Amino acid sequence: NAPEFTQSVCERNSDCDHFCGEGFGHCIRGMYCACM
In Å, what is the CA distance from 33 to each residue of 3, 18, 19, 21, 23? Predict the structure, then answer.
């Protein structure tokens, strides 16, 4: 069993620059996002 449903919330780190703000956005593995 190998499931993967962890959809990329950000395709680009710059999506996180919209979510957390530019310079505060970090895409973790291109899976989920974390803010500075």
Answer: 20, 11, 9, 12, 13
